[PDB]
Amino acid sequence: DADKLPHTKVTLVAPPQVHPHEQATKSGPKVVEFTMTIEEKKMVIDDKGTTLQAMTFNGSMPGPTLVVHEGDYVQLTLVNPATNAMPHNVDFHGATGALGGAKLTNVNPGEQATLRFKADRSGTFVYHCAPEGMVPHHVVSGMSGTLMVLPRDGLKDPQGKPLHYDRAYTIGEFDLYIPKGPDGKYKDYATLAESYGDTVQVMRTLTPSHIVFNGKVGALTGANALTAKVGETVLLIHSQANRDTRPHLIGGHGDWVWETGKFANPPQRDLETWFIRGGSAGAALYTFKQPGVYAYLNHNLIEAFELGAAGHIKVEGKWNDDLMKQIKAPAPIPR
Amino acid sequence: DADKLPHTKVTLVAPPQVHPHEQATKSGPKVVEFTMTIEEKKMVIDDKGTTLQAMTFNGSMPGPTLVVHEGDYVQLTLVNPATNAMPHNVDFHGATGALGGAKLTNVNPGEQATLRFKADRSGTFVYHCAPEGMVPHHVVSGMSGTLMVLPRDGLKDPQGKPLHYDRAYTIGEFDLYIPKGPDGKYKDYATLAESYGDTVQVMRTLTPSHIVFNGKVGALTGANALTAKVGETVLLIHSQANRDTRPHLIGGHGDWVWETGKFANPPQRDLETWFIRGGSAGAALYTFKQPGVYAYLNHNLIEAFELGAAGHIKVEGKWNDDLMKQIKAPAPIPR
Amino acid sequence: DADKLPHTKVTLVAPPQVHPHEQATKSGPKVVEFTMTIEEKKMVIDDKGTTLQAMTFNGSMPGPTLVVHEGDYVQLTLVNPATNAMPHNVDFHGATGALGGAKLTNVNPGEQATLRFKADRSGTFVYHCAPEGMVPHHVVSGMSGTLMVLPRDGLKDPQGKPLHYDRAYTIGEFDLYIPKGPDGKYKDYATLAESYGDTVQVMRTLTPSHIVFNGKVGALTGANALTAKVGETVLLIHSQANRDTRPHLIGGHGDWVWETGKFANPPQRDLETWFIRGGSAGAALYTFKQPGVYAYLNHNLIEAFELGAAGHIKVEGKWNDDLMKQIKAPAPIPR
Ligand SMILES: [Cu+2]
Ligand SMILES: [Cu+2]
Ligand SMILES: [Cu+2]
Ligand SMILES: [Cu+2]
Ligand SMILES: [Cu+2]
Ligand SMILES: [Cu+2]
Ligand SMILES: [Zn+2]
Ligand SMILES: [Zn+2]
Ligand SMILES: [Zn+2]
Ligand SMILES: [Zn+2]
Ligand SMILES: [Zn+2]
Ligand SMILES: [Zn+2]
DSSP: OGGGSOEEEOOOOOTTSOOOOOSSOSOOOOEEEEEEEEEEEEEEOSTTOOEEEEEEETTBSSOOOEEEETTOEEEEEEEEOTTOOSOBOOEETTSOSGGGGGGGOOBOTTEEEEEEEEOOSOEEEEEEOOOTTOHHHHHHTTOEEEEEEEOTTOEEOTTSOEEOOSEEEEEEEEEEOOOBOTTSOBOOOSSTGGGHHHHHHHHHTTOOSEEEETTSTTTTSGGGOEEEETTOEEEEEEEESSSOBOEEETTOOEEEEETTOOTTSOOEEEESBOOBOTTEEEEEEEEOOSOEEEEEEESSHIIIIITOOEEEEEEESOOOTTTEEEEEEEEEOOO | OGGGSOEEEOOOOOTTSOOOOOSSOSOOOOEEEEEEEEEEEEEEOSTTOOEEEEEEETTBSSOOOEEEETTOEEEEEEEEOTTOOSOBOOEETTSOSGGGGGGGOOBOTTEEEEEEEEOOSOEEEEEEOOOTTOHHHHHHTTOEEEEEEEOTTOEEOTTSOEEOOSEEEEEEEEEEOOOBOTTSOBOOOSSTGGGHHHHHHHHHTTOOSEEEETTSTTTTSGGGOEEEETTOEEEEEEEESSSOBOEEETTOOEEEEETTOOTTSOOEEEESBOOBOTTEEEEEEEEOOSOEEEEEEESSHIIIIITOOEEEEEEESOOOTTTEEEEEEEEEOOO | OGGGSOEEEOOOOOTTSOOOOOSSOSOOOOEEEEEEEEEEEEEEOSTTOOEEEEEEETTBSSOOOEEEETTOEEEEEEEEOTTOOSOBOOEETTSOSGGGGGGGOOBOTTEEEEEEEEOOSOEEEEEEOOOTTOHHHHHHTTOEEEEEEEOTTOEEOTTSOEEOOSEEEEEEEEEEOOOBOTTSOBOOOSSTGGGHHHHHHHHHTTOOSEEEETTSTTTTSGGGOEEEETTOEEEEEEEESSSOBOEEETTOOEEEEETTOOTTSOOEEEESBOOBOTTEEEEEEEEOOSOEEEEEEESSHIIIIITOOEEEEEEESOOOTTTEEEEEEEEEOOO
């Protein structure tokens, strides 16, 4: 009975980081308490100043990743401040009943609610806003993230051997539908509500104007590139709440991948490219063996390079000539 | 030898139901006899009166689901009445040879044919019309359904333990390509043939005008919502003969899912969203644990909510506070 | 250490064939040496004379398939003749480091380079050109193919039993983005560079003008149909470096399929249709049981029949009435 369990309180952190947590644990079930506050805001999503009338959990796209263990109960307080214009709620794909919790968390501006559900299934699961009659708009405008429910004894390979990560990153990929005016330039709207009708018309074409990681073209590049070192295992959590994508690490692999994101199923190994179904989160482990700057991207290369679905991982360490060697550098053809 | 086996005759039923059948059986192989009659007709596919010049097996989209067991022989009589305008045939993905049977079942209006094939592979398999030179048009206009070939000893989990369903529903998802005229309104055609050229032009854009379950926006809602009770296991068969989709049960899961639809392969568990490849049928089991109205939908939320790929399941029973509880209802933020 | 191993030299062959190789081998690791020469050229890609300003490895779309064994080292000399206009490189998804080798193989016209990497993971892997700032254009214009890394002891089923093929075919599927002018006719460009801007505009719509196997509509039909005989097992390697596809054999199955293309993972059996993620290669085995002309195609039937993603396999042998029989040929309906 959940009423008798110890409670713990977790402080969330901004993507692409994930809050401190244990993998395998000796701890018993707990009611794990989180809070998130909705923020509607205009955001610049590309290098030419295009804006999106966005909606977020906790001010970020994606929302922060919440981590618990199988058998825990998630207890979320959702706050919709009076500075917002629209009603919101939350649908946890990790939860059972009431449209994922959406029916129990309808919050108008100035209201808040607290939901509890049992995280009885391991995996990475999408959570997203789903207000009646406005579900697609809230989702594509930025209201999604990941709940990761770890098995109590940690991740396992197909033979039941232990797997682990040394650091975790969370990437949310957002298909955006920004309208254009008669001049062919993207429209800038004074309010969220005014963006609605024109946006729905673009949505219905099924053609995104932009597809971005973590809220903007280039969000995970330059100073904001992800980082690792040779010998470190990274977990890459990838959520796409509305549309399929196909993650790939250039110069690397998915060493162990749960593309449907559910840890009770055996992972696949050695993937070049994996598949995240729209409406899900998946998870890949990779242990770095070579230093350098990798790209992590959606391998529809138009979606990546033209529309924005690509980031970088900068990796320190020693080059390994057994894995790869330039035998002859570029030079004139003989003779 | 099939000539020496006992024959049985099955009466088909209209989707979303599936005809009575056994799962695990003590019965030996049989020649199972079915009949279907093709009906071309204009159908209203949305809430604003848009029509489709449609083509169906047995008067429905999808066609009815045919159920046999591995080792059985399917013997189909296909009838194309003289009231129809076009030639038709049938291609069973469950069958081996002759383009799935299409080469052996070419029936002009006023003709019929009888095909037998051995159902030697377990799974849910698409069947669809495939007349030479007109294959996409016949498929997207409605001529597909599912053949379910059950293992003789019933469904099995990854460890070989028995699985079962207490009721089965069949959902066919149809990407439609309805043309528009200069005024931006959908065109209404007097005959099937007159719809052809304009439809092909829309098809070639790869952008559906509508994506519907079971022939119409809202087909599986209101009085026609699917039904179950807490403690009942439902099988959800999902066919998409032309285009990918990504099924999801809001507030539920795929407890055991064969997304590629082939029962000799281990199922995956705990899925949030699964993937049906265009040209296939898949199958998910779910045991209800909470009462209420669920949505079953394609989790490209634009495809679901804007274009029509969503239905409802109304579930009776007792609410379970351990699985989910509203701890604090929506109320003003403190203080 | 790779420097101490025996070297071997492989002569590549044009798709859809694959160069002679062993499956299970008693041979130890080797440095396997290949050479490929880049050719930019205009190609006719459909039946109405539409041209593509194309770019190829070794003069073909796809490039040839390179076959080695797990533990081998691939040593490629890449040549970019002075008759070409653009810089190129190569990114092997089978390799670890330096953006798949791309950073180490930048070759301007008149240059060549030699890369070595360890093929330490079994599977079919895409290789493709990836020049900085021009990656999508080089890929969609034709610069991709497959590296197949076989396990040293051959392919295995989920229970570890041996699997084999008697012949192998390689199919590359290419989503093309050919621009149109004001008259609605496809544009013909005098040079590769002049095609660039207009092509990028089409790419950004995400709607291919054509989707072809092996460089052209109908490439694998008529005199160029694939061939087999009843009782022969074929391996069908399918690469798609940019966009998802869903292979299907009409009248057949994927008997054993690695849709993510990685041989250390158990294959699935009895597939009707499988899924190749954009940016990957997959592999299916099928043993023919019926003679006749099969179609092998992308089962988005619009993509196949309208846009070009379909080929034929002509199969010799004896018809098997147990698997399929025309019980009653098309004839007038009674009475
Ligand atoms: Cu919202
Ligand atoms: Cu959802
Ligand atoms: Cu037909
Ligand atoms: Cu088919
Ligand atoms: Cu190139
Ligand atoms: Cu790549
Ligand atoms: Zn308590
Ligand atoms: Zn580690
Ligand atoms: Zn008989
Ligand atoms: Zn039951
Ligand atoms: Zn050497
Ligand atoms: Zn053989």
